[PDB]
Amino acid sequence: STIEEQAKTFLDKFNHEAEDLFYQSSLASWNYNTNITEENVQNMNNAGDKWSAFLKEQSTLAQMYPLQEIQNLTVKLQLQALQQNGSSVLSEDKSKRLNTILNTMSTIYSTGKVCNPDNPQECLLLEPGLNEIMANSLDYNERLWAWESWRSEVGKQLRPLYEEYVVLKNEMARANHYEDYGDYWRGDYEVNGVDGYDYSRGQLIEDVEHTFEEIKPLYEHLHAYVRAKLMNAYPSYISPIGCLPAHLLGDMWGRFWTNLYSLTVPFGQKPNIDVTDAMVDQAWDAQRIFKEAEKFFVSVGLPNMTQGFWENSMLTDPGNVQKAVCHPTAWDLGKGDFRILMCTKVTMDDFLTAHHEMGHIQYDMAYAAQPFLLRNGANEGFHEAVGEIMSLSAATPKHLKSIGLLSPDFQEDNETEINFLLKQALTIVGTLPFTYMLEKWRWMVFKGEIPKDQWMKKWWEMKREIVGVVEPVPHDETYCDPASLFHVSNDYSFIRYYTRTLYQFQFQEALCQAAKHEGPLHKCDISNSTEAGQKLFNMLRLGKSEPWTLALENVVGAKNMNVRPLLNYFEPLFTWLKDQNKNSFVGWSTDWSPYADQSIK
Amino acid sequence: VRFPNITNLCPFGEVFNATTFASVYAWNRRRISNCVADYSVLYNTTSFSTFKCYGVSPTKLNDLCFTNVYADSFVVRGDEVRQIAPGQTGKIADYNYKLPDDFMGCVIAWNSISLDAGGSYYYRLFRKSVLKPFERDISTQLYQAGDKPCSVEGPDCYYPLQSYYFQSTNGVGYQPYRVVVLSFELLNAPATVCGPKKSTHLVVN
Ligand SMILES: *[C@@H]1O[C@H](CO)[C@@H](O)[C@H](O)[C@H]1NC(C)=O
Numbered sequence: 001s002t003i004e005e006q007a008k009t010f011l012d013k014f015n016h017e018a019e020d021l022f023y024q025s026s027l028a029s030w031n032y033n034t035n036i037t038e039e040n041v042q043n044m045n046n047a048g049d050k051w052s053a054f055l056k057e058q059s060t061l062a063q064m065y066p067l068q069e070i071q072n073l074t075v076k077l078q079l080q081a082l083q084q085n086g087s088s089v090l091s092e093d094k095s096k097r098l099n100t101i102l103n104t105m106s107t108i109y110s111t112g113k114v115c116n117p118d119n120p121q122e123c124l125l126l127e128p129g130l131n132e133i134m135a136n137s138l139d140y141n142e143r144l145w146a147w148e149s150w151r152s153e154v155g156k157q158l159r160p161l162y163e164e165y166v167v168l169k170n171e172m173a174r175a176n177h178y179e180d181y182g183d184y185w186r187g188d189y190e191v192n193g194v195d196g197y198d199y200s201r202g203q204l205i206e207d208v209e210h211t212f213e214e215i216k217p218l219y220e221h222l223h224a225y226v227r228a229k230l231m232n233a234y235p236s237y238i239s240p241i242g243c244l245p246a247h248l249l250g251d252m253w254g255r256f257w258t259n260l261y262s263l264t265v266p267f268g269q270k271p272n273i274d275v276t277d278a279m280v281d282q283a284w285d286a287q288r289i290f291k292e293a294e295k296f297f298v299s300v301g302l303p304n305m306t307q308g309f310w311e312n313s314m315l316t317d318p319g320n321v322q323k324a325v326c327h328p329t330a331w332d333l334g335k336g337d338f339r340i341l342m343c344t345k346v347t348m349d350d351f352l353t354a355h356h357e358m359g360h361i362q363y364d365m366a367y368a369a370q371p372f373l374l375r376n377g378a379n380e381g382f383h384e385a386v387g388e389i390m391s392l393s394a395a396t397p398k399h400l401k402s403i404g405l406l407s408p409d410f411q412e413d414n415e416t417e418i419n420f421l422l423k424q425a426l427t428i429v430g431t432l433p434f435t436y437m438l439e440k441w442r443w444m445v446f447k448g449e450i451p452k453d454q455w456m457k458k459w460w461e462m463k464r465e466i467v468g469v470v471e472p473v474p475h476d477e478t479y480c481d482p483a484s485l486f487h488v489s490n491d492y493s494f495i496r497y498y499t500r501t502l503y504q505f506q507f508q509e510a511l512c513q514a515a516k517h518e519g520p521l522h523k524c525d526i527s528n529s530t531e532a533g534q535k536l537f538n539m540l541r542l543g544k545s546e547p548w549t550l551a552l553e554n555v556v557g558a559k560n561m562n563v564r565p566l567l568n569y570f571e572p573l574f575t576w577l578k579d580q581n582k583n584s585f586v587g588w589s590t591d592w593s594p595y596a597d598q599s600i601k
Numbered sequence: 602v603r604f605p606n607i608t609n610l611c612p613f614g615e616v617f618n619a620t621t622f623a624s625v626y627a628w629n630r631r632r633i634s635n636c637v638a639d640y641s642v643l644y645n646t647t648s649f650s651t652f653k654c655y656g657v658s659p660t661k662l663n664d665l666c667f668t669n670v671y672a673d674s675f676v677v678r679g680d681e682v683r684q685i686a687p688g689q690t691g692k693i694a695d696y697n698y699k700l701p702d703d704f705m706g707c708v709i710a711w712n713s714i715s716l717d718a719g720g721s722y723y724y725r726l727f728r729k730s731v732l733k734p735f736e737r738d739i740s741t742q743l744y745q746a747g748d749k750p751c752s753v754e755g756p757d758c759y760y761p762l763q764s765y766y767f768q769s770t771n772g773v774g775y776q777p778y779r780v781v782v783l784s785f786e787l788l789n790a791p792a793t794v795c796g797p798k799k800s801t802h803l804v805v806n
């Protein structure tokens with residue numbers, strides 16, 4: 001009886017006993033994320049503790065089989081992930097305290113509301129409205145309210161909790177032989193043991209900072225172009241030399257400059273690339289948004305959505321009878337249960353996130369035949385990229401005509417290629433400095449480079465330098481503006497969305513070479529090529545069994561992320577923005593503040 | 602006058618339409634004999650997700666005669682129905698129910714989430730050797746994975762029979778499926794089971 005052979009029997013007993021335990025834990029968390037109730041937070045914690053207690057026994061039993069004896073990397077990868085004493089390293093009180101901090105943070109975000117001092121019952125919460133003010137309002141002082149109130153009422157509740165969440169997560173990662181919690185998060189990209197295809201945790205910091213330096217020129221000319229068109233919308237408010245005020249961007253934080261398109265579209269007289277108004281004229285229901293996204297995946301040969309998906313998913317906002325975490329999430333509950341939790345609207349953004357979260361499910365459905373522990377993407381960036389490869393082809397004007405959202409007799413122009421590429425850059429390019437800075441701050445906080453008395457000082461120092469965004473109101477160390485984002489409050493890594501963006505243009509190149517495309521990289525499409533979907537499926541089905549470095553080589557040809565496919569995707573817009581920015585200053589000043597005084601003494 | 606009972610109809614209703622089904626590790630085997638097997642009632646069925654026959658043609662069953670016919674029934678998962686076929690491998694084929702390589706007969710399956718939801722259904726996860734064709738292992742002895750002998754279930758000592766958990770929210774692959782395996786054998790011998798067209802053929806003495 002070889003150690004390897006008796007370890008496969010152990011993993012066999014694990015893969016079968018874990019199926020139903022993980023399933024009931026996902027069945028409870030789904031009922032809470034859709035029906036926020038204290039009854040469902042006990043049932044969630046009771047089912048989650050059953051799963052965590054089960055994982056502790058299996059982690060202890062898996063330590064009996066030494067990783068050196070097993071020569072089968074599929075078994076070794078399974079045993080390694082099962083062995084690691086994730087939270088067991090912490091004391092019983094520290095594990096319960098961290099779970100209370102992790103729970104209090106998630107609920108404060110999804111239940112926090114700002115109330116009228118005049119009418120206490122007049123409350124506004126982020127998902128229903130504070131987001132709408134920050135998406136459609138054009139008033140400087142109204143946007144300043146939703147921006148400051150969300151950070152002075154909810155972020156202030158999160159400040160002393162985040163300090164404890166850092167020291168607890170850092171004690172956890174160090175007892176797991178990591179430098180800090182940022183290193184623990186960076187281990188998702190780690191590959192060791194495969195010659196010529198390895199990747200260290202520190203290489204991610206190097207490669208991100210090396211690829212981001214090559215996006216700085218394109219971001220600058222987009223930031224200068226957006227500054228100018230924002231001055232016309234907000235006169236005598238933004239300096240021609242200073243940073244963009246944080247409350248004047250697309251959303252509550254500046255994650256996506258998508259909503260600035262109406263204020264920024266170069267040739268606003270052409271037919272709208274934003275097909276939001278067409279979805280209302282051609283009445284489109286949440287169902288059609290996901291049914292049309294189903295046709296895109298069916299077209300590439302990828303499976304149609306399960307019957308249980310349409311029966312058990314929550315695609316519309318339920319109503320006032322119950323509260324739900326309305327952030328777009330995709331659920332692989334286990335045992336073939338695939339769901340999507342989205343409070344879908346009629347906007348084009350929700351049409352493109354439906355493709356993003358269906359790409360999550362299509363990835364989840366592909367590696368379902370893999371063992372339980374290997375049922376995961378090769379890396380977090382691979383999982384978030386799959387849906388973006390589809391939304392990249394779904395937002396093109398050619399695809400928007402086929403679904404009837406554009407005019408049947410629509411004409412493509414050099415002008416229409418520009419205003420489409422700009423809306424792409426507002427979402428894709430505008431998010432990279434925000435994502436790099438948010439992770440760099442957290443990475444430095446976990447490492448201890450930023451002391452506690454300078455969390456908010458360095459946060460806005462970095463947002464002025466890297467992102468070119470200035471705070472409208474001075475923020476003391478009583479704030480925790482990072483935690484005002486779902487991902488920072490709900491213990492989720494953010495470097496996914498940086499690697500995602502670079503992968504989606506590497507994958508689109510290879511996927512559009514499998515399909516016959518003799519044209520430029522933009523206006524591409526793979527919406528009927530059963531050959532490009534198979535080249536995508538042959539990686540979707542692998543899961544985490546093979547390293548992402550090798551999985552990337554077998555699809556795009558490179559074993560590391562490449563920013564050149566991205567810079568080549570926006571080459572028409574980059575040379576165009578450089579022409580339009582001859583009359584404007586490309587760059588920003590870290591010294592101008594909207595709250596600064598205009599007087600000498 | 603009343604047409605006589607010269608021949609009787611095979612009890613396919615008692616097999617397919619049974620109230621309860623057996624577990625795969627303890628599959629139920631029923632012998633079919635001295636009757637006329639009308640396969641037209643099985644043909645007029647929309648619920649059958651699987652209807653594959655080996656060695657014979659599924660369209661010529663109503664015109665054939667066999668010397669020995671067996672009916673095996675059990676409840677297996679959806680993604681495990683593929684293992685109820687000649688030459689297949691897997692936990693079900695290796696440790697629970699193995700069809701012979703030179704198998705003549707039909708394999709019929711249908712979804713039973715409406716009836717077998719919850720339910721007490723077990724499968725064998727571990728075994729020292731692969732099940733021989735048409736063998737049944739109902740043993741409950743612990744599986745010794747390591748060198749250390751087993752006195753009680755523990756680290757390297759696993760209980761062989763594991764339970765199914767069938768829920769309506771499960772996917773199709775994890776949902777319960779009822780399988781009926783008709784096993785045919787023809788020899789140079791009098792016929793015991795015949796089709797409606799060959800009703801008089803050797804079913805009469
Ligand atoms: C919300 O939870 C309660 C249990 O407290 C349940 O009765 C009700 O049906 C749930 N509503 C929804 C929409 O899930």
Ligand SMILES: *[C@@H]1O[C@H](CO)[C@@H](O)[C@H](O)[C@H]1NC(C)=O
Pocket residue numbers: 008072073074075
């Ligand atoms: C790993 O072990 C499994 C048996 O559990 C085997 O089927 C598989 O081929 C092995 N992988 C490699 C790469 O040898």
Ligand SMILES: *[C@@H]1O[C@H](CO)[C@@H](O)[C@H](O)[C@H]1NC(C)=O
Pocket residue numbers: 063083084085176
């Ligand atoms: C789990 O913890 C025990 C002691 O609590 C330790 O001996 C063992 O090496 C740990 N395993 C891992 C994978 O960290």
Ligand SMILES: *[C@@H]1O[C@H](CO)[C@@H](O)[C@H](O)[C@H]1NC(C)=O
Pocket residue numbers: 399402525526527528
């Ligand atoms: C795919 O083919 C269908 C015809 O079957 C056509 O209506 C549709 O516009 C095509 N889409 C693309 C993106 O080529």
Ligand SMILES: *[C@@H]1O[C@H](CO)[C@@H](O)[C@H](O)[C@H]1NC(C)=O
Pocket residue numbers: 613614617618642643
């Ligand atoms: C099983 O019973 C149903 C009605 O309960 C009937 O329609 C069907 O024909 C029966 N099947 C067989 C094989 O007798």
Ligand SMILES: [Zn+2]
Pocket residue numbers: 356357360384
């Ligand atoms: Zn996502």
